[PDB]
């Protein structure tokens, strides 16, 4: 119906809307993580700053997907943003592991989106996904894996000195 | 239970959590409004920029309330962010009127919060609400009323030239 | 025969030559549009400047395709540049609609080229098309759609005040 | 019919349109020459740059003639731009000789145009031709003659060292 | 086994290791070429500088592939770097021809890698190859072809004046 | 045979070629070490940066030896660069110990080279070895010994906090 729509399948539009919702959910999860570490009984300032920065990046990703949906002539349809699975994250290492799991889930969703775009012969959507989302996801997963490895080697759960020093020297 | 908690009633904590959810909902509504005007069949760039700026301000307000909740020793509890009431907003004037209605609703919620804080003899919470939320809400309501009045005088619904010129000269 | 030719099918070379001709034709059409609005009985200076800028961009696109043809070891074969379908364009809105139609035609040609490159297993050609032509085409179509929508809302055909104000405020 | 038309004969308008077409054809020929020397089996970068610069100048000349046609109240009528007479130019010296022949042809056309303008008692058109086209044509012919003479003296056809050194020292 | 591994097939990992070895071999070959021209009985300084620059670029390409292997969770496995096929290269033209042959071989290897990645449905690897290796390879092949053509036209083997002047004017 | 050769014994030329191969092998070993620490399950960025810097320094040493071989009129003869003895280095301390062992081996080779040059009465070669290689080797051995001592005192193998803090404070 749109005057600008060309070679844009409806299934691609629906999948783009789903990815928008997933990105907003990830932003919400990162916000919850960030303000968990601002509590007085946790008090890890650099963890909070890191997760807040991640939350803002996820919001930017969702906005970029919405702009893409408008560019191709599709229609945005927003759903409810579900609350995160946890209220307390119990440690920096546990929050890092949960963030890694969430990023791998988002990467799987993006790979499904790219496969769908390939099946519909939509080169512009494929290139958009490759240029703006796949490499950023790979880099994020690699960085979170590095952080988890360093915290595990330091003795993160049992020794709070480990999380304290990781907060200053790596995330500071 | 918190080592920093002093003169902070549980009802105030619950009301602060509710206000956090309301602020996030307002941010979501403004994001929906902003990307409605980025569509090719609406194409009002300055309306979209205005509503995106409003959305970012609402997110900042929610983050400030979360910081306040952490400062006093309360615990943040997040709920689902409901999707906005509308998908298409049908005009700049209608979106402005809906934004005015939403801001008046938020002002009523903040006034209820202030009354609750007064009843519990919590001067810090009362002053926080007065300093950071009440005057900003009054200014926002006044500005939205001015915009609605100008659009109505210009003939906003029937004449698209009115919305075009308002987009360039007022919001540009 | 070329010492640099590798994995470059002849059908791809022929399609590249055809795309070169199409780009030059689009440049010619935009030049005709630009100097239509420089007439004393039309006198829309910013429309003329916009279409001249589009013409120069199309010439750049054709030159880039010729450079690509030389890079892979193919041979450029030029054809006649057909004169545009119209010499008088009758309004800014009509010229914008014709430009939108032309850009959608060029996008369809580029999509056919990308499909042909995919069928021949030529990743370099596919990436070249994706990187330099597909997103620019999508952006151009979106911008032309926005312009057409704004002109239609203002009342572009019947009211010359609409085209006058669009010339100053949007294209100026 | 034009409100600005004064002392502008129809034959002059037709001849101006013909000159516009000739200028566009010359631009096309120079583009073909320029990308002939970008081939890997020719590989004379400075020859290609020289001919591309000539092509851009010819396009500017055509645009100036179109502006002149609009200034006097005549109507532009575009024809097909014929493809150049050759695909391969076989040497720098041969391309230079062909460019010299083309420029002398364009000079003859401009002299016929000036004679026609003189016969119709149109001083503005005569002065426009004298100021913007005749001296530039004479300078171009002189420069091309100098280049042809130097290439012939160096032994351009048989010795490729001649064309190599001319590319670096004269056109570089 | 890696915590960051996702959608990364083992055959892709093995092919990445093979490409790493090929890149290191190319760097070694270019180093041999570079120091062949530093000999007192050859004494072409700019040829040596050119080939040393190529060697450093190949080392950078190998390091980038190793970084890619670490990013996706694969394991690097290094093999022996074979000595180059020749120790004396006998002329600048012969070295240029051998470099062209080597670059075409590397391009064929990269195309096989891209085909393998496509067959395994690995969009990130495909985009990495397209973004960082395919266009650089095409440009390198085009430049080497240009150099070979110019040297052949000047009379590179029989006339040492040709190689001397090419060393100063093109590679200097 | 070389016109520049003077007081340059064949055994010295062969030993110089062997030292070139040894330097290239050391560069390869350091590259392997550097990218071992870039893995997600090791994740010691500063160790990786240190070993990459060492690898580049070894490549520079090999290039300097090749330049020396060309200066005196000898002929470079390259051999295969053997793959390093290990794939995984298992700790920062173990990699440091292996680097120390490798540097002591290289120092022994250089001392044998200097003794050979002394026996052949070649003062220029002796002074070249003394000026550019012996003191650098002594400094490298001293620095690696310091690093090994500090890691051992910190408790490097059993305690990963030791390697983490050494990575930030010494190598950072």
Secondary structure elements and their pairing?
The structure is cut from a larger assembly and holds 6 copies of chain A (172 residues).
Chain A lengths: L9 H27 L8 H27 L20 H28 L3 H32 L5 H10 L3
GO molecular function (chains A, B, C, D, E, F): ferric iron binding; ferrous iron binding; ferroxidase activity; identical protein binding; iron ion binding; iron ion sequestering activity
InterPro entries (chains A, B, C, D, E, F): Ferritin (IPR001519), Ferritin-like (IPR012347), Ferritin-like_diiron (IPR009040), Ferritin-like_SF (IPR009078), Ferritin_CS (IPR014034), Ferritin_DPS_dom (IPR008331)
Family (chains A, B, C, D, E, F): Belongs to the ferritin family.
Entry summary:
By secondary structure, chain A is an all-alpha fold.
Task: Describe the protein in words.
This is part of a larger assembly, with 6 copies of chain A (172 residues). The first copy, chain A, has a single domain (10-170), classed as Up-down Bundle (Ferritin). In chain A, helix 1 (10-36) packs antiparallel against helix 2 (45-71). The termini of chain A are far apart. The first copy, chain A, is 72% helix and 0% strand. Chain A has helices at residues 10-36, 45-71, 92-119, 123-154, 160-169. Chain A is built from 5 helices and no strands. Chain A is elongated, with a radius of gyration of 18 Å. Chains in contact: A-B, A-C, A-E, A-F, B-C, C-D, C-E, D-E, E-F. It is classed as oxidoreductase. The entry lists the keywords crystalline ice, crystal ice, metal binding protein, oxidoreductase. The entry is titled "Structure of human apoferritin embedded in crystalline ice".
């Amino acid at each position: 119906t749109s005057q600008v729509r060309q070679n844009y399948h409806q299934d691609s539009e629906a999948a783009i809307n789903r990815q928008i919702n997933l990105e907003l959910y990830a932003s919400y999860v990162y916000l919850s993580m960030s303000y968990y570490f601002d509590r007085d009984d946790v008090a890890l300032k650099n963890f909070a700053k890191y997760f807040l920065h991640q939350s803002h990046e996820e919001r930017e990703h969702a906005e970029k997907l919405m702009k893409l949906q408008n560019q191709r002539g599709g229609r945005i349809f927003l759903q409810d943003i579900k609350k995160p699975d946890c209220d307390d994250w119990e440690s920096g290492l546990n929050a890092m592991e949960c963030a890694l799991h969430l990023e791998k889930n988002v990467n799987q969703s993006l790979l499904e989106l790219h496969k769908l775009a390939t099946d519909k012969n939509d080169p512009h959507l494929c290139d958009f996904i490759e240029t703006h989302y796949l490499n950023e996801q790979v880099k994020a997963i690699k960085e979170l894996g590095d952080h988890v490895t360093n915290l595990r080697k330091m003795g993160a759960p049992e020794s709070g000195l480990a999380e304290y020093l990781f907060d200053k020297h790596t995330l500071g």
